Each structure stands twice: as structure tokens, then as C-alpha cells.
Amino acid sequence: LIPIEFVLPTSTPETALLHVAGHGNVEQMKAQVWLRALETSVSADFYHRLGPDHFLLLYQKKGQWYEIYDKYQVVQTLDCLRYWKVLHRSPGQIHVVQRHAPSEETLAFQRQLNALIGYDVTDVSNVHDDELEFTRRRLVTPRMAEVAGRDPKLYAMHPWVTSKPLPEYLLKKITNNCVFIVIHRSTTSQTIKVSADDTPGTILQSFFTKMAKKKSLMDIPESQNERDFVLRVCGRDEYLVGETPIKNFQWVRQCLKNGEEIHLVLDTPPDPALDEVRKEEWPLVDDCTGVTGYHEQLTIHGKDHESVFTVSLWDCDRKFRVKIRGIDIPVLPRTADLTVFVEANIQYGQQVLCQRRTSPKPFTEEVLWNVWLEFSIKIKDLPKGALLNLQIYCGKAKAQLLYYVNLLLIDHRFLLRHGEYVLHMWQLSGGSFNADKLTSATNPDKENSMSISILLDNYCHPIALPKHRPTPDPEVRAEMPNQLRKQLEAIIATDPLNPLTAEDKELLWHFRYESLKDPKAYPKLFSSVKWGQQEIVAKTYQLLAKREVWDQSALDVGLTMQLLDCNFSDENVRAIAVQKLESLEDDDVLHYLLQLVQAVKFEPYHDSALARFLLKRGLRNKRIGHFLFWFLRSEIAQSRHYQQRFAVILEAYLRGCGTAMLHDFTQQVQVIDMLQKVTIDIKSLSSQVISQLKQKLENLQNLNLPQSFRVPYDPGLKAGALVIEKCKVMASKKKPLWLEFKCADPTALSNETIGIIFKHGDDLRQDMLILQILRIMESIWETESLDLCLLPYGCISTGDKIGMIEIVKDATTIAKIQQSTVGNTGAFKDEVLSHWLKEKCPIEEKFQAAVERFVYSCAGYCVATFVLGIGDRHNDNIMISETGNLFHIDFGHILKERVPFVLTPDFLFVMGTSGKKTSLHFQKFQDVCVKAYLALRHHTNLLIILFSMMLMTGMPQLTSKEDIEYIRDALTVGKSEEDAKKYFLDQIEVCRDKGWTVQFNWFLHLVL
Amino acid sequence: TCTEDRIQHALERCLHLCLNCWSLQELVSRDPGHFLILLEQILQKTREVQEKGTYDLLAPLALLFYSTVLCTPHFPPDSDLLLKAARTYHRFLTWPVPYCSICQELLTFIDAELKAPGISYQRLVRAEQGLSTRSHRSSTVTVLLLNPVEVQAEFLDVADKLSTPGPSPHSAYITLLLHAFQATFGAHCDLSGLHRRLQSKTLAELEAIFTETAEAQELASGIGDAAEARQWLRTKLQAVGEKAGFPGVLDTAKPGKLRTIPIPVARCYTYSWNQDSFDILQEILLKEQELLASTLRVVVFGSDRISGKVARAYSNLRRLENNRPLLTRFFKLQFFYVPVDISHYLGMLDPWYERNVLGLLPILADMLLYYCRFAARPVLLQVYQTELTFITGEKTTEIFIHSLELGHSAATRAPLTLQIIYSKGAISGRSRWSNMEKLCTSVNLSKASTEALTLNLTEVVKRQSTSQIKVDKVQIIGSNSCPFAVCLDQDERKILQSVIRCEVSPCCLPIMTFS
């Protein structure tokens, strides 16, 4: 028993002292308190009118009010008891406070958040548990912890720095380690020369000291000094602040690369008071909430049946058992004489532990089985993240899968499910595996979908999964035979996709302490664990508990992104993978941000280490949050399988950004909504279209169209008023909108507009994935001092089938250039592109620079598309700039005569090789291609774990390993560098052999 | 040995058939020593099930244990059989409902029997004989509702024999004292001397002695520690025997011979049931005022047609009383069905009932009492409600369980534009209403989770096409106050007429079963 003094609400404040059963539940304690208050209370009428469900239990832990939220938790495990014992408090005080209705302002803020998210997080219509409300309550602690510890000025100004070394192609441009900076204030400009290692503070101090005599001109109030001002990129919002050398800001680098002057304006710092956060609504929820305890406390052995309150899961030695009652759909999908049957499978990740199925029956509108399916697996061997995978197969008179649904077998509170269930199944519209097939959510449409009724057994007491006790492990040993060590090393050195034979698994698990010394063997050593046996799991936790080498190992993103895949569903492998990502810079979390957001789809539980890591890194930088918001909102609007989890995460984020960051999000979701209704109306219904659009656009300025908003794909650029004399509708099947705004910042150095393409009726997520991979590949090439002059433009998906795309100025499609002379027949002259480029560039030096740029760009885009396997493109999807750069567009689809990549005789003519002749430029092109290919091969594991994800969370249609082996074949895994060089040169000759043979066939296919 | 293998054969032949249990309970009773051997074998078999997982063989074993452990003449102090049984049944807490709920109630009985020997047999006997004390008084009475005609004469002879007052309070109190003393002091007591000395004593002193013995046993059952409870009970009984004046009867260093004490026949009353309503019971309750929680064991000897009207009478005595408590005022009723539909249904669920009850002093008397005594778990029947709105505005809620016609055939047993609306439903709790009227002659509601009635439709529209379908709920409305009869489970007496609107929808005194 435990003495506790509850402070009741009725007044002086009445108190009740009670003794609580240690192993009882919170609901039991509530009932006992209510029963005592019914008698002790002077006025029991107040307690008779209401009940125990109209009050909250709050306790103060170090100046903050925590709440006992779980109405079943074991009283013994309440963290309040531990806190009191540490402080030597007895009896503890627990305040009982009555529930109140939310104020009006709370409801208004909630509605605003729901509007921003695009989904009602407060809905409880499609749920069979309280996992999502419990996650909302739990995520309060990380948000407060991160908000409290943020530097106001650095948050408000978000400098964009990096620590990587300066690539060699940039040290040539820095002469004598000095950089020229142009400093504007008002109508005055001055060029200063500074050292490349000077922090912005030193730069200012030097400036002021120089111009101290002439401060009057610059218009710097005499009473003000270098501490009142900051530097700001002219035109954009990219403050240069903090303690960092001038050479480490991504702006300065970018400007150097492009050979452009660095223009900076003196400005006043933003006031951090604009980033105040609304006071938290809910009290914090006790930390030890999802904690169950150890086996010794939970076991039923060595106890009396009258003293049993919980049963350990590891005490059940029976075989699992599920009852299939029946299936039922309102209307048959297909009309024929068909047989159907149900298949149940236990599943861990992608592994099918067991499998049972029922006898076929004719496919009527309601099929009834009432059959107990028994699985070979015992109830004690069930692992945390298992998933009963119910599937409906149809046979004629093989079998074709029709519907699927998943049900967890251990909830977020470490308890075994029980009772009847009625689950609404998804439909396999459209391969062997996809991410969509792991979701544990049910179909929202409850009126026109198939439903499976199951029944899991009921038990007298809750059955809980104990917690592995961290006990010292016995294992010593000695050296390994030099044959077995060589065999093990050979096993470890294989590519990530090489399957493992049973002998390999046995060898890895036998010498599981030698493998622990090599980090690279972790992704294979954890694939050989028999997750269907409790003993081997408790032996795996005793091994993971000694994690010295992994902690001391250097960070490799290609290895740590391999433990987050769908193969590992254990929370302790993922936990360490995240512990290893928590040391990544802020410049490198932006490269892999989209992959890490897509990797949340593989998490069996809503609350996870990876979700908390994204939440924390979002609340710390003001540029990793602009993109987390738009990725989560792009996923919510389209993926009905995972919209509720992303909605919860996005709500958790949006309650800590600030008021400015919410104003911006609002002023952008408005622009977007207005331009999507415009698009819709335009399509629904020549000069017609022209005038119609002009009208609508000019009348949107009589609505509430924001006059200044941040471009969604470039958070640093502010766009203002439309230029309605430059907009139009592009000539295409889907009629994109060609909008052109103008910069809202009056400090800009030019009158150039901001071009934006608004698309509708198409999904752009695949474009985003491909562009992210291109940026990753350009970082890899930068690592080795290679400048292939790629041009990944800005693309972003904003909602359902809609999107926004950047416009590249002075660019045109190669198809238009060909049609400018040939016409629209299907012929292709070979010298058109060269003549066009020469016309654009009259000066010889400009022409040579453009041709070199062309060369490099083509080499890099051929290599990239060959590696990705999407190099077979129509000539209409490749554009070229007036400076010679070349790039691809419209990747949203590509994801009997075939080519590896587009190298039509026009490119080769630009280079100089008219036929099979060779020229200096085509030799330079070959050398660049070979170097780039070898550099890419250096990161084979990374690119092989990024492609697999691109495919499992990308294209909606299911995929098989045959789809993934292409990347293995393209990178020439396991071959010497000479062999790879020969292979790529052979591919080049293959493209140099077909000429216009595939282009013509694309033209014919499109015309026909 | 031969005896052990005989017992094992009987056990393996009762767990496969109606008199295969009675034969066990008639082979064991011979020697007081046969009750331990049987228990060991049962425990062995139980452990096997625990290892295997045979969900279907648990409930019969839990009934044999309870049955034997309650007649065991005596447990030697050395024997640890009860402890082994408790350890064996402790591991069923991890099984699914209701097995865990049969095991908790067996473990409680095994602690009550571990601490206070003979308590579970003195409670039963006490109650059934209505010879309780002034502290914990209870009672049980058995009424044999049997139809003189429909039922065979053999069951009449059995009922007559069971109705003969068997014991007297004097003999019952002597038997209770003898079994309370033997259970505790084993062979170390002299039951012949105890009986001879108890015979001459008066009724009042015997009642006082039993009241002290029962109070001591009850208090001993409350003791926390098991080990000291037996010694405390032994000392208390020794003092009681010293006070009563036969100290030279207990603790005899010389050992005697164990004797088996059977359960005395319970009190029974036989009443002529020519009707079907359960009003008879309230008429009986007048002599209960003079014949006085408690309990009443109503043994409704049962036929087929009877079953229908028996459920109908059950109906009233269910709701009627729930709303007009008259019998429930004192007694908790429990009805027992003797097969002489309800049968079929109660068998498909609980085999032990089928195998035993359905397969059926004389052997029939023993088996009857045995069933009535040990079967203690109910099965709720599946009934359907009907609302019959009449022309003058009369609405009557009937409750049928077999069938229900309405039409030309309803008059025949004693064609219209009958509006018909029906609502089927799926296992997922989604309904699919339908409002299709068909002009027809006869409509028969046929008893096809829950159960979905079937709608019969006889569309013989002739000048000068009978269809049946499933239905979860039905509504048959008449054509502008047009008369039509209403059958009731193939009734031949109560068939009303001129009805207009009839809606049929799916719908203590339990129907006790063993499991």
C-alpha cells in the first residue's frame, strides 16, 4: 500500500488521505478516491452530480504541472512515486481539477491549424484505439524542450552555413585569399576587399572604422555603431551573421561558382519578439507512460490467484489463434462466377513468419466462415512490431489479390489485442511490395468498402509484453580459423542487395561478437536474427547493449539509411540509427530530408525516434521547417494510407514555429488555393481562354490575394504583385499556368520577374524525389572536385494533383529548335542546335564558354540518367539555356528498340564529331563521363539504398526485386575500374550507333 | 493394478455415453481409497491438456474434479494432492475466457477444501436439506414440473420415489456430524462409537452441536495460512467433542476403518403440470410460506410442443417477474430441461449436456440428481419479438422462438395486398433496407452470432410463385384494416384474427447447463 493525499476541489480545500494498492491501475485509484470522497466529503452532492470522468489528476514536478493521462497504468510505475521517493515525500499530493470547455480562442486557433494542415487532426471517426491522441499528448515534451533552448537571434536570422572544405574548382577563383564585397546602404555603394577567413563581425568593424569619418553620407545615425546592423543579401532574405568565416556561407560559395559579385545591404536585425509562441494548452504527460516493467513483476508464478493483476506475455505457451467471422461488401466489384478465400499471415517487416488460409467459397455479397485459424507461432514468441496481414484472394471458377488490411498485434501501451474487430479493407488498384501495404490505418470510406470481421480471444487480465532487463552477458572466446574469418569477410563485403543463404545466417549469428567490431556488418548481422523466438531477441538486446564501436565509428549516411528501411521493424535498431543521425550538420539534413520524411512510412508506431528527430530539427532551423511543412502537407493531401500520422506530426510542429512562420504559411496557402480554383475553372471551360484568364486574374486582385508571399520552393525569395500582361496558358494537354510575379523587396538589383508554372491534374512527387537524388549526386561529385554544371530547378508539390514549378529564364526545348527549321514532319537536321546556340552567342569567347558548358552538362546528365535508368526520353523533354547549359524536365512518367541515354547526332555535331570522326571536345566529354561514373561507383551502397526507397515509397504501383536489380547491373557491382570504364564507353558507342532511330519512333508514337 | 486400470478405463470411456459417468461414480464409491487414485489420474490427464492445448477437453475435467473432491471421504495428512492440483490449475490463468473463469472458481474451491475439510459437502447438504443455522441460513427446494400424460410412466415412478420424504432432520444432522468428524480425523476416530452415542441424543443439542461445528468450519476457512487452519479446526472440534461428552471417541490411538458417506437425497416436490404457463409456481408459493439467498430447482420435464409453450411460459416468468417480482422476492429460480429443440440447441453448445441429459433408487434418479446438482452454467436461448397492432388500436408484444405464420394458412390451421418491408444486415453491422410489397396468400416466419429469420411468401395469384428469402427484421402491414390471422410457433389453439400490422425483430431464471 502507498499513502497518498488527494486535494479535492470543494472548498477550504478538502483533502482525503488514502492507501493505494501498488499494483492497481489508475482507474482503480480513481474509483477508490471517488468512493472515499462520497463519504468523507461534507457536501457529497457536488460529487454526486458529477463523476470521476469529469476531473483530471495533476501533480507538480519541479514547478510544472504533470497529468496522469493513462487510466490503466500500473500505480507502482507512476513517475510521481519515484519523484517523491527521491525527494522523500509522503504522502504525495495529487490535485483533482474539474474539466472545462475550451475557450473560444482555443477553438479559433485549432481551426486555423486544421486549415493550415488540410486535415482535421481532432477527428475520432476512423480509429479503433487512442494512439493518435496519445501521440499528440506525448509530443508536447520535445516541443517545449526545443523551444526553450533556442537562440532568439540565430533562429530569427537563420544563417545558412556549412563546414565542408572548399572544393578545388573554387580555390582558383579566390586570389590571395581575398574576396571583394559590395556594400550598399540607401543610395550609396562601396567595394571593400576582405580576407576569406573574416567573420561578418570583423567585416563590419573594419567597414565602420574605415568610413567613420564619412558616416553622414551612408546615412548611419552617429549614435549608432556596428552592433546595431547586420548584413543582408541584396534582394533576398539571407542574413549573413554568426561566428563563421565568410567562405562558409552557401551564398558566398554560390556567387563565386557563378562568377557574380556579392552584393550586401546594411540592415536592422529582425526583432525576435515576432517569433513568440502561444502558451501550451495541455499539461505535460508523465514520462513513464508506455512503460510496463520487467518480467519478474509481471509473471504469474510465485503468486496467489487473488493477488494477480497482470499476466506476462512470456507466460503464454499456446499457439496464436484468430477467428474469421466473414466478409461483406455492399456491391460486387466484378460480375462472374468466382471463388474467394481469406489468407492470414503474421508479419515482421517484410518477413512472413506464419501463414494460414480458409477454404474457397462462391463470391457472393456476404461470405460467412466462422473459422478458427491456428498459427504455428506461440503467443510468447510474438515480437513487438508484428502485423496480422489479412488478405482476400479471388480465384476463377491462380488467385488474384483484391483487398488487404493490417492489424497490429501489440498496441502502443505494450498490451495484446483482444475482442471483436470490424476492419475496412483497402483495394489493390493497379509487383510484390509497396509501402502502402504496411499501413495500419483502415479505409476512411466506411460506406462502399469491403469489411472483414475478426475476433481475437479475451483474457481475464491484461497481457503485457515485459521489458528486457539489461543484465550482464556471459560472453569468453578466442581467434577464429583463418578460413572462417575469410568467409565472414567475404560475406560482409557484398552489396546491400545480395541475398543471404541459411549458411550465411548461421555463420553470422555464431560469430556475432566478431561481427560487432565492424560497423558495416550491422545491416546484415541484424537480418540473420530469428525474430520469431524470444530467446534470440533477449540475446540480441544483450548484444546491442555493448555498442562502443558503433558509437565511436564515424558517420556514414549510406549505412545509417539502411537500418531505417522496411527490412528492420525493431525499435532498438532504428533507435541507434537515429542516435547516429543526431550528429549530422544542418546543411546535410537538407539533402536527405525528403528521404527521411518518406522513411516514416516504415515505422510501425506513430511515436518514434525518427519522428521526434524530424520534429526537433524542424524547430531549430528556419529553413528545415519550411520544407518539412511542405513535404508533410504534400503527403497528407494525397496519401490516404498515412495522412493521420503526418497530420499529427505536422500539428506538433506547427505549435512551435512562431507567429511569423504561421503568417507566412497562411499567406502562401491562400495564394495556392486561389490559383488552384482559377486553374480548375479555366480547364473546365484561343482568344476565349486568353481573355477569360486575364479577367479572372485581374479580379483576383479585388479579392484577398496576398500582396507578398515567400516562394514555396525558395524560402528566401519574396514575390509581390502579378504582372497580368505577361501571364498566359501554355499550349499543352493539361494547360499549365505561366504566372510571372515581381520581387517584393525594393532592394533588388534588377527588374527581373519571378516565373512560376502552376500545374494541375498531375502528381509531382516523383519529380521531387528525382531532383533530390540529382542534388545528392551533385554533392557526391563536389566531394571529388568535379563541376558537371547540373541545373536542378525548383519543383514542389503543394496539394492533390497540383504543384508549382520554377521557370528557367532563357531556356527552350530541343523539340522547338528542331521544329523551327524542319517543321512538324519527323525529319531531324543535325546542325540546327549548333546554329541556334551560335546565334544566341555571337562573341567567340562566349560561344566557347557555352560549348564547354554544354559538354559538361551533357556528360553529367547522361551519366545521371543512365545510372537512374531513365535516360530513354523523348526529345521534347530536354531543354537548353542560352548560356549553353542543358537539363531535363517532366520526370513524372518515366519512373522495342531502346537506348541508354539521349545522345542524338545533334549533340555530337555541337561537340564536333560529324559521324564517327573524333574531336577534342568528344574526348573531353568521354573523360568527364568516365570520371563521373567512377566517382558515382564509389558510393554504391548509398545510391543502392536511395534507389530502393525511391521505388518502395515512390511509384504507387507495386514493384519486385527485378525492378531494383537494374541499379546493381548499371553500377557494375563487383568489377574493376577498367571494366567499368570499358562498359561505359561501350554504352557511349551504342548511343553513337542508332542515330535518330528512337527519336523518330517517339515522334511516331506521339503523333499516332 | 487391476483396480487402477479399471478406473482408468472408465475415465477414458467417460471422456469420449450417458451412463458412462454414473458408472464412474458407482465404481469409485465402493472403497474410500478409490477416490484418491481417480483424482491422480484426472490430474495427470489435465496436465496433458495443458501441454497440448486441447481446448475441448477442459470443461469436462473441471467438472469431474469438482464432483469427486466433494465426496472424497477423507484426505490423509501426508497426501499433498490438493497442492498439486492447485499448482496444475494455476497455469490456466493465461488461457482465454471462459476457461480462466472456470479455473478461478476451481482454485477458490480448492483453497476452501484445503483449509476446512468437508466444507463443500456440508454447504451443499445443509442447503438442500434446509437444516441451516441462524447465522448463515439458506435453502434449496426442487420442484418436478412434469406433465402426467405427455411424459412416460417411468419418469412418473422416478418422480414419486424422489417425492417420498427420505431423511429426517435427526438422521440428516447425524450424517452431517459423522461426515464433518470423519473428514477431519480420518481413521483416528471411531465412527461406530460416534454413531451409537449420537443416536441417543436429543434434537436440540444435536442442532447446537452442528451449529458450533459449522461455525468453526466457516471460521477456519477464513484463516490466512493453510497449515495452521487444519490444526485450529482439529483443536476446536476436539473441544466441541469434549463438551458434548464423547472425548473417548476421537484421537483414538487405535485406527479404525474409513466409511463412505453419500449425499442424502434432496427435498423434492412433484406437481401436476397440465397447463403450459408458469403460473403454477405462484400457487405453489402459498405452501412455501408454511414451508419456510435461497434457490428453487424447477425441473421442467420436456417434450417438443411443450418446449415451444415452455419457452413462452418462460417468457412471462422472465419479463413478467422482472417487472412484477413475486417469486424472485425470495428465491433465485433455475430451470432444468429434461428431454423426455431446446435439447438440440443446448447440445450443440455444451457436449456434456448432450452426452448426459440427452441420453436419458433407480439409476435415472441418481443421474437426474447428479445433473441437477453439478450443472451450474447457463445458456441463453435465441428468441424473436413481435408487435401485433390490431384494427381497434390494440398492440400486443408476443415472443416466438420457433415459427410464426400469417395468411390463408394461418386461418387453415385455426390473398391480400400485404405491404412487406424487410431489412437484412451483414456481419459488419451494416443494414440494407428494402420496401417491396407482394400480394400473396400465406407468409411463414421460419427459424433459419445472431440468427436471421426467413420470410415465406406464397404468391398464388390465379385467374379464370411461392418465394422464400432471408430477413433480419420484417414488417408486414395490412391493406387498409384488412383482416388476417397470426399463427404462433405452429400454434393450434391461440391463433388471433383480424390483425392489421405485425413487425418482427430480433429480441434470475436461467436454463442451466453443465458448461
Short mmCIF file of C-alpha atoms in Angstrom, two decimals, chain B residues 9 32 59 88 138 150 171 194 198 303 305 344 352 360 376 391 422 448:
data_model
loop_
_atom_site.label_atom_id
_atom_site.label_comp_id
_atom_site.label_asym_id
_atom_site.label_seq_id
_atom_site.Cartn_x
_atom_site.Cartn_y
_atom_site.Cartn_z
CA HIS B 9 -10.72 -47.39 -18.47
CA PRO B 32 -12.90 -44.92 0.32
CA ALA B 59 -14.59 -28.22 -19.13
CA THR B 88 -1.77 -27.57 -12.05
CA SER B 138 -30.03 -20.81 3.16
CA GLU B 150 -47.08 -36.40 -22.26
CA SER B 171 -30.82 -38.50 10.65
CA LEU B 194 -19.73 -41.83 17.46
CA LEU B 198 -25.10 -39.63 18.79
CA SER B 303 -41.38 -32.64 -24.87
CA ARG B 305 -44.55 -28.97 -28.43
CA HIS B 344 -30.73 -29.88 -29.80
CA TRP B 352 -21.54 -32.87 -21.58
CA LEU B 360 -31.70 -40.35 -20.79
CA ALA B 376 -24.35 -24.56 -12.83
CA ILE B 391 -57.59 -2.78 -36.06
CA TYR B 422 -37.68 -6.11 -44.63
CA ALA B 448 -33.42 -20.35 -40.24
#
